[PDB]
Amino acid sequence: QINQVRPKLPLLKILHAAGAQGEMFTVKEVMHYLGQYIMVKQLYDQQEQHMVYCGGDLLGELLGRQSFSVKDPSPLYDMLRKNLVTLAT
């Protein structure tokens, strides 16, 4: 057993649509399922594989924006700030 926290139903949907290893994880575990989700869903640019385009996806509707970069993680962590509680203080 993991001994960690469950994100809300829409966010858990992204992670399960990716194939997550439970319903209880840390920020660093939950966000790893986004990387595998995009790699399976191939939501990145043809020109820039590290640039992500979630427009029309559940992950995009949940982000509230069609795009972010592997070099700019900020809006993911902000979508977690209010969806997911962590050990961090």
Ligand SMILES: CC(C)Oc1cc(C#N)ccc1C1=N[C@@H](c2cccc(Cl)c2)[C@@H](c2ccc(Cl)cc2)N1C(=O)N1CCNC(=O)C1
């Ligand atoms: C899925 C595409 C976009 O990912 C990549 C492609 C490239 C290129 N060119 C370079 C890097 C990745 C990358 N970098 C990480 C990452 C770590 C920390 C922060 C962030 Cl934001 C990203 C993580 C990932 C995790 C969450 C998300 Cl939301 C998206 C992507 N991520 C991967 O999931 N990877 C890299 C390793 N092998 C794989 O098969 C997939």
